[PDB]
Amino acid sequence: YDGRTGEPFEGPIVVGQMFIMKLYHMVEDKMHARSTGPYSLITQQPLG
Amino acid sequence: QVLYFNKYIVLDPKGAVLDGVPVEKRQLLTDEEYGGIDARMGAEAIQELLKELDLEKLERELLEEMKHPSRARRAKARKRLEVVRAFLDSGNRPEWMILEAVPVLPPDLRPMVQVDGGRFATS
């Protein structure tokens, strides 16, 4: 059944308990953004 | 290679030429291969050398060994010009190739930044 609309799906559906996992990568450690900020002094540009 | 380091003396000028053998307005002579100098060593040699060096004449001393040659070492002959004419119809003079001035680039380019306290990191 599609909880949103009382009508169920129109085709049996393969269902069951599937073992899964959470991997090393987790956006939380990726993701960034810089409008401005730390300008290197060596090369003369954004770093650190 | 031997015209600065390893001593070896160059034969610049002038000076009427043969000491135990002629010796064809061109070069060297060995260290303890006496003679004297009246030429020098170091780059001064190649310097006052270049300067006093007919520019156009070689356009002729090469434009005469270009049509009546063997074709074995009369091959580099041409190549001489390729630098030659390269200096001529160019506006660039030789000599200067030996430096009477060894410049210094700016600081803000070869930095002296402070590392973690008092010990630095030159470029």
UniProtKB/Swiss-Prot annotation, chain A:
Q: Which domain of life is it from?
A: Bacteria
Q: How does it assemble?
A: The RNAP catalytic core consists of 2 alpha, 1 beta, 1 beta' and 1 omega subunit. When a sigma factor is associated with the core the holoenzyme is formed, which can initiate transcription.
Q: Which family does it belong to?
A: Belongs to the RNA polymerase beta chain family.
Tell me the function of this protein.
Answer: DNA-dependent RNA polymerase catalyzes the transcription of DNA into RNA using the four ribonucleoside triphosphates as substrates.
Mind telling me what this protein is named?
DNA-directed RNA polymerase subunit beta
* Primary gene name: rpoB
Swiss-Prot record, chain B:
| Top-level taxon of the source organism | Bacteria
Transmembrane stretches in the record are none
What's its job? DNA-dependent RNA polymerase catalyzes the transcription of DNA into RNA using the four ribonucleoside triphosphates as substrates.
Family stated for the protein in its record: Belongs to the RNA polymerase beta' chain family.
Subunit structure, as described in the record? The RNAP catalytic core consists of 2 alpha, 1 beta, 1 beta' and 1 omega subunit. When a sigma factor is associated with the core the holoenzyme is formed, which can initiate transcription.
Quote the protein name from its UniProt record: DNA-directed RNA polymerase subunit beta'
Q: Please name the source species.
A: Thermus aquaticus
**Lineage of the organism:** Bacteria, Thermotogati, Deinococcota, Deinococci, Thermales
Range covered out of full length: 125 to 538 of 1524
